[PDB]
Design an enzyme around this catalytic site. Structure first.
Site, PDB file in Angstrom:
ATOM      1  N   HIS A  10       0.816  -1.242   0.000  1.00  0.00           N
ATOM      2  CA  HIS A  10       0.000   0.000   0.000  1.00  0.00           C
ATOM      3  C   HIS A  10       0.841   1.280   0.000  1.00  0.00           C
ATOM      4  CE1 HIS A  10       0.518   0.200   4.473  1.00  0.00           C
ATOM      5  NE2 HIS A  10       0.556   1.490   4.168  1.00  0.00           N
ATOM      6  N   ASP A  70      -0.580  -7.356   1.607  1.00  0.00           N
ATOM      7  CA  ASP A  70      -0.018  -6.029   1.706  1.00  0.00           C
ATOM      8  C   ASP A  70       1.481  -6.157   1.927  1.00  0.00           C
ATOM      9  OD1 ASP A  70       0.392  -3.413   1.862  1.00  0.00           O
ATOM     10  OD2 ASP A  70      -0.348  -3.163   3.904  1.00  0.00           O
ATOM     11  N   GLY A 111       3.652   6.395   8.651  1.00  0.00           N
ATOM     12  CA  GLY A 111       5.024   6.570   8.259  1.00  0.00           C
ATOM     13  C   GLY A 111       5.888   5.387   8.650  1.00  0.00           C
ATOM     14  N   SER A 151       4.612   2.326   8.153  1.00  0.00           N
ATOM     15  CA  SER A 151       4.191   1.357   7.132  1.00  0.00           C
ATOM     16  C   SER A 151       5.320   0.797   6.332  1.00  0.00           C
ATOM     17  CB  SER A 151       3.270   2.047   6.110  1.00  0.00           C
ATOM     18  OG  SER A 151       1.968   2.101   6.655  1.00  0.00           O
ATOM     19  N   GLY A 152       5.335  -0.518   6.173  1.00  0.00           N
ATOM     20  CA  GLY A 152       6.294  -1.159   5.283  1.00  0.00           C
ATOM     21  C   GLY A 152       7.531  -1.588   6.064  1.00  0.00           C
TER      22      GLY A 152
END
Ligand code: B3C
Length: 246
Positions: A41, A90, A192, A194-195
């Site tokens: 995402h 995701d 922020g 995320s990932g």
């Protein structure tokens, strides 16, 4: 990361910052000389591949580091189930434009096997340069934050998300997801982050158990962060990396 502390340089040498047009948008984890894992995402179709960069080996985003390297991307590969259905998957593989050389500050994290299980209650660590409270950014020079969080099973996590939930809000933790955090909140990943990695300790090593994916407001009670399980994608990651750029 809310409720954490600043990592010392070199502590989490697989953590990378992904920027778009120079602005930090997501974390990621280095997993080989030329591949990073992050969240699908983080990579909207509208965005142009060549405007992304990955910064490795830096603990402070705003501070020059002689140990830092910055790379553009050759490819961005979200898992097909994210593109096709969008309810899970995701996760994305990012192929760096050129392979990197490892250093004391840039090292890959080991990936778990397909059936690796990480027990409920295992104390793992999530890291990132995301918000340090809901609606509050990490200030310059942006030191990487770290936070120890116990794993919370997806079943417990679903029950927690159901407390005071709106019936129509999508708060379902799927089979390829795990949570981590506290029922009482206050300590969590935030926007922020995320990932980036949920790194779990196993047999003296660290493994990438999860990829920061989603949650409610950062640090809210009954709403621990939700992570994509790397184990759920192990076969796909290993196939892609080995076929395309082993
Ligand atoms: C399988 C799948 C499909 C789709 C997604 C994408 O969900 C987006 C990216 C994620 C996101 O924000 N993650 C950040 C990491 C969070 C760590 C856990 N904390 C990540 O750093 C990030 N990503 C960003 C993208 C754009 C802008 C800023 C972004 O920051 N969201 C959320 O966390 C939504 C969750 C809603 C949801 C639930 C089930 C399903 C899909 C979405 N939560 C929220 O907005 O907070 C609630 C609230 C109430 C009140 C005030 C503030 C916040 C939305 C992910 C997974």
């Amino acid at each position: 990361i809310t409720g954490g502390s600043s990592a010392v340089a070199g502590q989490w040498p697989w953590q990378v910052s992904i920027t778009y047009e120079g602005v930090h948008v997501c974390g990621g984890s280095l997993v080989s000389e030329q591949w990073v894992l992050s969240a699908a995402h983080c990579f909207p179709s509208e965005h142009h591949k060549e405007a992304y960069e990955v910064k490795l080996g830096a603990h402070q985003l705003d501070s020059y580091s002689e140990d830092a390297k910055v790379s553009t991307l050759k490819d961005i590969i979200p898992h097909p189930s994210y593109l096709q259905e969008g309810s899970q998957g995701d996760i994305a593989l990012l192929q760096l434009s050129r392979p990197i050389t490892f250093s004391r500050y840039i090292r890959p994290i080991s990936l778990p096997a397909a059936q690796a299980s990480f027990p409920n209650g295992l104390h793992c660590t999530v890291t990132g340069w995301g918000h340090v409270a809901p609606s509050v950014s990490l200030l310059t020079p942006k030191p990487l934050q770290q936070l120890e969080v116990p794993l919370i099973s997806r079943e417990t996590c679903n029950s927690l998300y159901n407390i005071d939930a709106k019936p129509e809000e999508p708060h379902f933790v799927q089979e390829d997801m795990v949570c981590a955090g506290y029922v009482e909140g206050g300590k969590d990943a935030c926007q922020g982050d995320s990932g980036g990695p949920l790194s779990c300790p196993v047999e003296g090593l660290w493994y990438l158990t999860g990829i920061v994916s989603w949650g409610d407001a950062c640090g809210a009670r009954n709403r621990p962060g939700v992570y994509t399980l790397a184990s759920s994608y192990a076969s796909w990651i290993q196939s892609k990396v080995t076929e395309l750029q082993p």
